[PDB]
Design a protein around this ligand. Structure first.
Ligand SMILES: NC(=O)c1ccc(OCC2CCCC2)cc1
Lengths: 194, 197
């Protein structure tokens, strides 16, 4: 069930598609980034077409939509990473096993400006920085804390019925942490400079 | 969902107690007694977890596509403590919760070929009533190599293509006795064996 806005992959299961600047898709993703990163220069935006990651992610989304008994489980967030991690994330997505104040999960920022920090989007031996735009199944969330390996339970009387993610601040979240594979789909890769 | 599962009436999860004398019970008992003849089985439960099954079967279809005509799936054992059983039944095998193995071939979830390995008190810790717990697990071993203690994912097949990974690792490729998996939904807890001395 590969999305309509994907372009043909000649029967292959993975490709990185460079977006055409000035077209609707590129402009939408650039706007999300320039909301907080207008001083950064975008070299390119690539659409990540990873059939297997998409499949696994969409299954988790359908499950979370059933479990939570409503949609609105998905947020579009940012993830800065070093150039050496980009091939892995493109192919395999996010891996909690690869500061973790809110738990031992994968971190995503609400604002590109946070992911744009050199500590996350480390400039490569050419000044280029890399940030993903990520579909994240945040679902029902709670405040995180150091040392979590999964989200807390919604009620400790049922210790296996878990929150879907944690955040720094439930009323005004700026980051989300997920603890399971295939809760996040890297949808675009932005290559940019300071 | 498999057509021989009990009707769960829209419910997403059930444990089904098997009957001795049914082929399904007897095959698991025989697989267990092959190496654990000194222990006695209290009961065997079939684990019907719709979401874990769906996610696992997606991963299996993907590995079946990627590997072409490999037997990607092995039926293996996993001993665990009573405290972990409710979590595994609902959520499967989380590498983030895994103990360090006495012989480490990587930081992942360990599965044994022989029930005797999983039957060690270090894995199937007897509970306060002397009950030991072992899962029988469909594991996507895929294409595997000898692991190494440092691993947090399986190693690449080719050092010049670091993202094209083995599916799992083992202690010995010639004579595998354990497999380690490093990803969620690569192992489906199919049966829970409750047993005693
Ligand atoms: N890679 C990223 O984009 C990213 C990394 C870390 C992120 O929050 C880290 C928390 C904020 C302060 C304490 C820990 C968010 C995003």
């Amino acid at each position: 069930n590969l999305p309509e806005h994907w372009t043909d992959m000649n029967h292959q299961l993975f490709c990185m598609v460079q977006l055409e600047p000035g077209q609707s898709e590129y402009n939408t993703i650039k706007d999300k980034f320039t909301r907080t990163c207008s001083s950064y220069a975008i070299e390119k935006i690539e659409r990540i077409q990873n059939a297997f990651l998409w499949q696994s992610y969409q299954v988790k989304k359908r499950q979370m939509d059933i479990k939570n008994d409503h949609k609105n489980n998905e947020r579009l967030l940012f993830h800065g990473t070093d150039a050496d991690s980009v091939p892995y994330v493109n192919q395999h997505g996010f891996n909690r096993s690869c500061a973790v104040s809110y738990g031992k999960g994968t971190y995503f920022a609400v604002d590109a400006s946070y992911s744009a920090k050199d500590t996350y989007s480390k400039p490569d031996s050419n000044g280029r920085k890399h940030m993903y735009v990520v579909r994240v199944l945040t679902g029902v969330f709670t405040k995180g804390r150091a040392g979590l390996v999964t989200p807390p339970p919604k009620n400790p009387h049922n210790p296996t019925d878990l929150f879907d993610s944690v955040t720094n601040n439930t009323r005004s979240p700026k980051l989300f942490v997920v603890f399971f594979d295939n809760q996040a789909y890297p949808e675009y890769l932005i290559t940019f400079t300071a």
